[PDB]
């Protein structure tokens, strides 16, 4: 449960400083690669935190929350004040439906900021099961919000919290406030996309996701998230096209194949479903390049 399942035959076990190789693969809009690189820095230098953080932060973007949490926990193990790790933790547990671990992470994100640590003096009606923890850091983030009316990362955090309680009404208001401020943050355009999609407006969502891919043309979550909206609107041709681009860009892959298996299913292609068990995205022709 503790350590990372490192991928064997890592070509960066042979490269002198691979941190820099990866950091610019992330610059080259190529997550699958940049994850391998950082996987080496973590194996070569266990004690270096910006390696575990870049690793986690990247795996989350590469649609693998599993490995992302394992990685961020080691980055946190090394520096428990690291607001970017905690920000990311909250997002990942929210996605993974681990509520208590999410609230804890948001709270920790806030209280680690020196400009808010003044708030550590703390003390039926509104939603959540896991209730004291949620009433707390909802208060805490509003107090933070009436200190600094236009902190984008404060809205984005409220957005995260309101997704956990299934209030995509308020989540979308805040995450809309958060982009606008920072209209070129891909992380933030996706968050809007997902909030909207979860709150049953996939139409709008698809807009929000396109702005994200305009900024980071190789962001694998999002490609996946676009499949999820197209699937929810029962436009399965489109979902299918989008998932393939997402599977391709992911590199083996995941339960990503399980999702593709149920599309081809409802689509009435017993063939194709039969040959998903080969690694190969190769045969699946509607896109080329």
């Amino acid at each position: 449960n503790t350590d990372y399942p490192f991928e064997a035959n890592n070509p960066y076990m042979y490269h002198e400083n691979p941190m820099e190789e990866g950091l610019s693969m992330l610059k080259l809009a190529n997550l699958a690669e940049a994850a391998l690189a950082f996987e080496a820095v973590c194996q070569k230098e266990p004690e270096r935190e910006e390696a575990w953080r870049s690793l986690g932060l990247t795996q989350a973007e590469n649609e693998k929350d599993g490995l992302a949490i394992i990685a961020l926990n080691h980055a946190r193990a090394l520096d428990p004040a690291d607001i970017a790790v905690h920000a990311a933790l909250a997002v990942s547990h929210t996605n993974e439906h681990n509520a208590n671990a999410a609230l804890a992470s948001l709270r920790a994100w806030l209280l680690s900021q020196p400009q808010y640590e003044q708030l550590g003096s703390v003390n039926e009606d509104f939603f959540f099961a896991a209730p004291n923890e949620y009433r707390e850091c909802r208060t805490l983030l509003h107090a933070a919000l009436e200190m600094n009316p236009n902190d984008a990362q404060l809205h984005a955090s409220l957005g995260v919290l309101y997704n956990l309680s299934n209030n995509y009404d308020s989540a979308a208001a805040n995450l809309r406030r958060a982009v606008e401020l920072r209209p070129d943050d891909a992380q933030l355009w996706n968050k809007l996309g997902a909030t909207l999609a979860n709150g049953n407006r996939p139409q709008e969502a698809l807009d929000a996701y396109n702005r994200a891919l305009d900024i980071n043309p190789g962001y694998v979550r999002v490609m996946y998230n676009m499949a999820v909206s197209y699937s929810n609107m029962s436009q399965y041709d489109l979902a299918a096209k989008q998932l393939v681009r997402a599977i391709y860009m992911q590199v083996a892959t995941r339960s990503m194949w399980d999702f593709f298996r149920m599309l081809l299913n409802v689509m009435n292609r017993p063939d194709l479903v039969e040959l998903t068990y080969a690694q190969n995205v190769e045969p699946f022709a509607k896109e080329f390049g």
Partner: peptide, 7 residues
């Protein structure tokens, strides 16, 4: 329509 989107 019932699948979950990711933040």
């Amino acid at each position: 329509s019932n699948r979950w989107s990711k933040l």
